[PDB]
Amino acid sequence: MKLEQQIQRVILEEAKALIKDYHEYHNRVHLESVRNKKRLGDSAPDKKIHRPNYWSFDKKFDPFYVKSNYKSIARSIANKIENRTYLPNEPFTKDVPKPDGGIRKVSIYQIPDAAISKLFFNRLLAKNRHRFSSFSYAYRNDRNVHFAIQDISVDLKKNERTFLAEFDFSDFFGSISHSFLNEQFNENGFYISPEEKFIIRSFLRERKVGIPQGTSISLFLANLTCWKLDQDLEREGVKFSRYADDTIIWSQEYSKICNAFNIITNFSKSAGIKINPKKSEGISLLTKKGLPSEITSKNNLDFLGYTLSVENVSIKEKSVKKIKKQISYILYRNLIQPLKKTSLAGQTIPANDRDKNFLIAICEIRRYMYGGLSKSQIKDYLSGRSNRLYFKGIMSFYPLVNDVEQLKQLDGWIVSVIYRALKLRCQLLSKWGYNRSHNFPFILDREDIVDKCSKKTIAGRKLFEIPSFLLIHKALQKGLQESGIEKIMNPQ
Amino acid sequence: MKLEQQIQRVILEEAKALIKDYHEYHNRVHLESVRNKKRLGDSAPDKKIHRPNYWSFDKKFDPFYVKSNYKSIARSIANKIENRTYLPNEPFTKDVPKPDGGIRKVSIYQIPDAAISKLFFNRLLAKNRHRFSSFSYAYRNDRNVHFAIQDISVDLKKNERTFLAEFDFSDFFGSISHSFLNEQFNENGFYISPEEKFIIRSFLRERKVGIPQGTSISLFLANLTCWKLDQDLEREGVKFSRYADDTIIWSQEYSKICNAFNIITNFSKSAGIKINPKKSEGISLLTKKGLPSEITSKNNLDFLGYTLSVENVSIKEKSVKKIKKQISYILYRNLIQPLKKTSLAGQTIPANDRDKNFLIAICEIRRYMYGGLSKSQIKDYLSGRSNRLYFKGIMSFYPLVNDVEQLKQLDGWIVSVIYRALKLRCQLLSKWGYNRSHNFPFILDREDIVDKCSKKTIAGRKLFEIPSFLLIHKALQKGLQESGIEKIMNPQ
Amino acid sequence: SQEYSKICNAFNIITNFSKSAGIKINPKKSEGISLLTKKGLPSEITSKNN
RNA sequence: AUUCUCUCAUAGGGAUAACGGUGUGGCCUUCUACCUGUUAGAAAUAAUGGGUCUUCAGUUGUAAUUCGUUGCAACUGACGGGGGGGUGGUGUCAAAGCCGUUUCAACCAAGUGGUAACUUACUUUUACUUGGGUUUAUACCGUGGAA
RNA sequence: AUUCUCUCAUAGGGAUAACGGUGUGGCCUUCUACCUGUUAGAAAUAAUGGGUCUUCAGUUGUAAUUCGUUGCAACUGACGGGGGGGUGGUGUCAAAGCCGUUUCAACCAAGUGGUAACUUACUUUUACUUGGGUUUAUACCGUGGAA
């Protein structure tokens, strides 16, 4: 087919995606407003509906208007791409620096330009994916972080002490030399058509150095420049794994890991990229616990939310603290916050050994960790009674974790936090003039919360059971050997 | 879905494929019989239709009977796979030794067993393709011979002299140790379910050593055993490319290529495979023409139908001789063979400057080399007037050839052979009593055959033009940079 | 030995033999890799005199 | 109008008012061990209502082997953090320590110079919600029309 | 029966005779520079019939640059093997050589001790045929039924 049919179909799909997202967004907002009213009573605020503020800067940002007039835009763009006159329109770049983080300025392009960028990125990736290295895991459709994690986990067990080099790059996207970039189009066996070359050069006219962020065409150019670095790194004879601008190298020889520094420095001098000397760790020796070392040594390393070691693979401390933050905020929101207002008009007071708020908080925690599964369904999957199960929780993002002790400590932390939150709720209810210290669940003790909640039934469903990380860990371990990583892992 | 639906669908597709092939086969036979009658006149033999002789050995070989009764076979097999009682039936192995070739005994299995083998091979390949090396090109759906050819062609240009090691293995499939094979299922991070282990072991019960040939389940086991060999070969720091049991290694260091021999020997001792000392070439130094060498040296090497060198990539001599064989036989069949019979009853004698046999031979040659394209369509593709063209000829099997001189010599050989065949046809027609030495095309000379045939028209189509390899080479070169290798290459 | 790489390879040989024979080394009575020099000479890594 | 047209087609002109989604219910079919109530009615079966179990490592004693690890009874071992105060053991020449009872803390806090708040929130690889499909049953959410 | 059923389901029982494909034509739509005949009829356009062109490297002289390589006239260089005999050049002190005319060979054969045959053929990575789709137009090919 001609280029105009492809532009028309890509533009139509892109336009319909934003409309679907907006239609789901305002319905979620209405449902959450209704539940907030039922929770806060008469103290709930009013519902507010917002629209993107950049939809009014230029008419072409609005997906409804783009969809209404897509055939003419297609026609025009096609003609100007066949007349060598096309030029992307200036983007909207409101991104600004954030505390403790890089500015990370990101540009948002209009729908026709982003559609052209994605269309021309897909064909280049399809034509040239077979000439990339097997140790690059970013911006591709056949590799993912979990493959690098599995490769490092498998390789580190074999030996007892290995050397490691960790280095970082400063301003990766904004420091690529244009004369360098243009010289790689005729090397390593790549296939770039003249029209594709034109389209690529059309996106760099405004700048004098670096490549734009926020667009899909720069993700191929990001992997294009490191082909010689990966070629020389593999020729050296050391193992490595690179994701975007973050890399790690390990080897058994000091001389080999010293030569890897010279290779990295030579590539940085060739491409004009300067390394950051404040976020780099350098050369260190990783050994098992208790073994002495002659040089600077460490026991574990962090890589993309994981904590690799000689023995086990665990979750990073920052991600653990964010899980604790979300669970604690859910309990505080559903138990303590409503009772701190000026008046209790429209609220509901627990009575007759019933508490809807505790059930709601438990259900929300179960939806946050499991995703809605029950312990009976999990045990049916484990016993082989059933042969189908879905993974849609937070644990789906860390399927390679095999550290039981950390999960046990998280379970004990959850139980203690729940007990103390219920104690504070009881004290606040006593302060308001209601005494419910002899009713469920305020009467339960810490040592019997799980056992007593494991029995209470409602409508034939055990809706009061406390989720455990160990059970879902066992289910993930069983499903990994029967379906694979790609199937088990989350789609995002 | 359950296992029975998958078995039912796979069996049905396999059964319908043979029926489609047979229905196309007997129609091709009838058409060829009609044309043979019109060509040989009254001396043509009678049409004969055959059936596979092994269809009567066991009813289950017949696809019509299998299709008629597929649901019961599905049911049964499923039940016995869920009761741990399944066992493949003995195959039919009529393959025998051939002169100048290995016996290569091949077993044909029945449809349900081959369907189970393919079904269980597909899921294993999907679950474990990400743990294979990037330099293995056999029995996969993401790598092909042409990728290895492009990698060697690109790498050899950079340097002027490299060392090479070429070695071969004797009886690869029939010498794998079972105790070795069973020990690799728990290493390198593989994922094999217990049911899959059962199915695998079910196909090796009869033998005491080696794996069966002719089935789809052994193609995964072929790539499974060489994981440690490829791991150590990549750890050494040398380049290589392995396809099935054939491998090549090249490097810049004598010590590195000497260590590659020790790695190969250690792997052969570990797996029990013995190398053949009569089909191996050893260690040689490849240099450019005219440069002296201190050790045994050569100028080019052969790999999978190609002839690689420092400068160019050409076609192997054996494939060139087979192309010449096919062209010469086509000309002999359509020009000389009919006139050597006892009587010319029912034949047609050329007259009034007309010759249907010459036109038929030219059309068959064009279909053999191009596939039916015309020089006007090719020049339209080259000039950019059109933007779509198909490649369905013999040249589609060698798209990376860039040796113009060889194609020019083949063109001159074609012209000379055509001229001499027409001269012999004229002499035979003179011997039968007809003098046509002053009529087209017997009057044309060698130096004007192309120029005169390039003008004659019939029904507005230049059906007498002589095909040239250089034009299709230019079209292949242009299409490679605009669609890619996967798209241009043949589907087989 | 006189070479750091050679004394680093000796560790891999010892570890491979321990894995082959099933013997496990004790990490509390071992001293590791150290450089022995004469008294008064500086060292770049952990050093001892006797 | 987010619906439909028109062409000079990253724009401009007409014509019609509806056009996209969410919750609940329905239907379609879809992977499931038992034991018991009350119904119905022939135990073909249904209909509903209650309760239990599922994992791993062992030690066996044995069958099977296809010469192994297997399948098995029976067995026994696992399987929900940490911190600050008080008070008994038992620790020894002192002691560490090791035992368990009783209190305090919504979380970061096993800490800060000091400790409260927050989810349409906050941010560097950092994000997702419950087998599908179809329902002019049923109630509502953008934006229009009417007013 | 290769069609449909039935269950004890790698099998066995019934019932119906049609069931799968190929060539040609049709239709649907699908990527295409011109110049000319004769038609038709208004040059809106058709309908058919004839003929030419398409690639790469240069040298420019110049415009554009977005500071380059570009786009351009015009230019000139490419673009269909080898072998065995005869005979002229020109080779030089001889000579190699280098020039081109004239004959012989269906291919392997630029070779074998010797050279004919073969495609439903022969064989180690070794194989495929012409944008699709739909046509109870039209003629035929397996296997059934009828006979």
Author numbering:
A (entry chain B), B (entry chain D): 1 to 492
C (entry chain C): 251 to 300
What does the publication say?
DRT9 systems encode a reverse transcriptase (RT) gene and an upstream ncRNA, occasionally in association with a SLATT domain-containing protein. Here we show that DRT9 systems are triggered by phage infection to produce long, uninterrupted chains of polydeoxyadenylate (poly-dA). Poly-dA synthesis is primed by tyrosine residues within the RT itself, and is templated by a structured ncRNA containing a universally conserved poly-uridine tract. Our study reveals a mechanism of antiviral immunity mediated by DRT9 defense systems, in which a ncRNA templates the synthesis of long, kilobase-length homopolymers of deoxyadenylate to drive abortive infection.
Interestingly, after protease cleavage of the N-terminal tag, we observed a shift in the gel filtration retention volume to a monodisperse, higher molecular weight (MW) species, consistent with oligomerization. Following protease cleavage of the affinity tag, we used cryo-EM to determine a 2.6 Å-resolution reconstruction, which revealed a hexameric architecture — a back-to-back dimer of trimers. The hexameric assembly is reminiscent of AbiK16, but the mechanisms of assembly are distinct. Although the structures of the trimer and hexamer are nearly equivalent, the hexamer contains additional density near the active site that is not present in the trimer reconstruction. This unmodelled density may correspond to a small stretch of poly-dA product, but repeated efforts to sort these particles failed to separate distinct conformational states. Notably, the U4 motif (123–126) is positioned ~8 Å from the YADD active site, consistent with a role in templating poly-dA synthesis. Incubation of the oligomeric RT-ncRNA complex with [α-32P]-dATP, followed by denaturing urea-PAGE analysis, revealed robust and highly processive poly-dA synthesis activity that completely consumed dATP in the reaction, and that required no additional reaction components beyond the RT and ncRNA. Biochemical and structural data demonstrate that a hexameric RT-ncRNA complex polymerizes dATP using a protein primer and poly-uridine template.
